[PDB]
Design a protein around this nucleic acid. Structure first.
Lengths: 158, 243
DNA sequence: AAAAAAAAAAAAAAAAAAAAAAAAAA
DNA sequence: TTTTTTTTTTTTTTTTTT
């Protein structure tokens, strides 16, 4: 339901003839990012499923072809919807830090053969956003320092 | 920005270069036509430009029956015997494939829908203009490279879109009751103009001496079968328009 | 008034895309 | 003689059937 939405949006944006007919529909991307805003109050039931959708979108649609439009642009846009789900979910839900942050790190550290640039982007965003909110969930970082020797060099620099 | 006057200035300049300068070198014509199309399709539907370019291809290449004297060189100057035969045909058929994908998306959303009337009016307008476009190309003699099988595949896509359209008409005809008149002219044009010359083109490609031609004949017979069911369940005889 | 092989998991087939090789032109 | 393009092949992914 997310990949179909991005295919539809790419098809309309590439052609004016379809822009004249079809009146501007909300897409599943904007609806999901509304769910993450809505869930702040009491909806903790929702947010453990937001985290699983985030990492299913990133895990399934991340790059591999560099280690084209149709294999690239509705898969680039889903994988960057994933990171947006997890970064907006990380900011407001003060209890699924250490469930995103130990799972981002667990994909950066252990995979290291498949391309993982998207997780380093997400980890950069998560850190850079607030290291003030990461000093309450910091030991998940310093347990991946002990695995730094065995990584390839570019992953260590990154 | 695609609504700016500088967009229209760039589109007019590109079109003027396309209307004057010949330049017999395939890569230059291909990249310049791609620039023109890329500008055009973000402004308005390209079907007029596709129609004129098919007329140029028909005028340069000729006909299958070798007794049709047609020359329409006035339209677009970047059309040559060494340019329009290998390279321009693939580009105009690829853009036509894109327009067929767009109307397929519209047809599928119109099936799922049951905002109603102008949508289907624009759909049958694009299909009519593309029908005249395809009518101009089916009579021509293309080289036996990728061009002929690309024409068969895109004609299969054309007939598939027509089949899906009359399928939506089969879905909708019970609630309202009746066929709009523009659809009647469209099915007259598809029966009279396209399909006999499609048969003649199959004979033309077959006589000169394996998968696309069975696909195409299956597509056209499924079109005729769904048209039988529509002409029964619509209280109108659309086979007197057909041959 | 006529139409279908869909029947939780797995396997096979088809399609598409990417890479490699070969041929041609300067 | 080299570089680019085109054509073919192989691999991977998705869908449909048992």
């Amino acid at each position: 339901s997310v990949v179909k939405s991005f295919k539809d949006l790419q098809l309309l944006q590439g052609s004016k003839f379809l822009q004249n007919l079809v009146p501007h529909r909300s897409y599943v991307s904007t609806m999901i990012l509304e769910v993450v805003k809505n869930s702040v109050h009491s909806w903790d039931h929702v947010t453990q499923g937001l985290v699983e959708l985030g990492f299913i979108l990133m895990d399934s649609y991340g790059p591999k072809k560099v280690l084209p439009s149709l294999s690239r642009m509705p898969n680039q846009h889903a994988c960057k919807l994933g990171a947006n789900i997890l970064l907006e979910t990380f900011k407001i839900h003060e209890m699924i830090r250490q469930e995103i942050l130990e799972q981002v790190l667990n994909r950066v550290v252990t995979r290291a053969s498949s391309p993982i640039s998207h997780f380093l982007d997400l980890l950069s965003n998560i850190v850079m956003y607030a290291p003030l909110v990461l000093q309450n969930c910091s030991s998940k970082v310093t347990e991946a320092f002990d695995y730094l020797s065995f990584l390839p060099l570019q992953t260590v620099q990154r | 920005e695609p609504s700016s006057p500088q967009f229209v200035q760039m589109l007019s300049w590109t079109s003027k270069i396309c209307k004057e300068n010949s330049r017999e070198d395939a890569l230059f014509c291909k990249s310049l036509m791609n620039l023109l199309f890329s500008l055009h399709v973000s402004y308005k539907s390209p079907v007029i430009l596709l129609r004129d370019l098919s007329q140029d291809i028909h005028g340069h290449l000729g006909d299958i029956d070798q007794d049709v004297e047609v020359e329409k060189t006035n339209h677009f100057a970047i059309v040559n015997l060494r340019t329009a035969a290998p390279t321009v045909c693939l580009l105009v058929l690829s853009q036509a494939e894109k327009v067929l994908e767009e109307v397929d998306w519209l047809i599928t959303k119109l099936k799922g829908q049951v905002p109603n009337q102008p949508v289907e009016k624009a759909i049958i307008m694009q299909l009519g203009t593309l029908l005249t476009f395809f009518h101009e190309l089916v009579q021509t003699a293309l080289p036996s490279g990728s061009c002929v099988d690309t024409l068969l595949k895109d004609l299969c896509k054309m007939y598939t879109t027509l089949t899906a359209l009359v399928r939506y008409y089969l879905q909708v005809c019970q609630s309202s009751g009746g066929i709009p008149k523009n659809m009647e002219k469209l099915v007259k044009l598809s029966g009279s103009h396209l399909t006999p010359l499609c048969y003649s083109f199959i004979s033309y490609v077959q006589n000169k001496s394996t998968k696309p031609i069975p696909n195409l004949i299956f597509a056209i017979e499924q079109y005729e079968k769904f048209l039988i069911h529509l002409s029964k369940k619509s209280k109108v005889s659309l086979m007197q328009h057909m041959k």
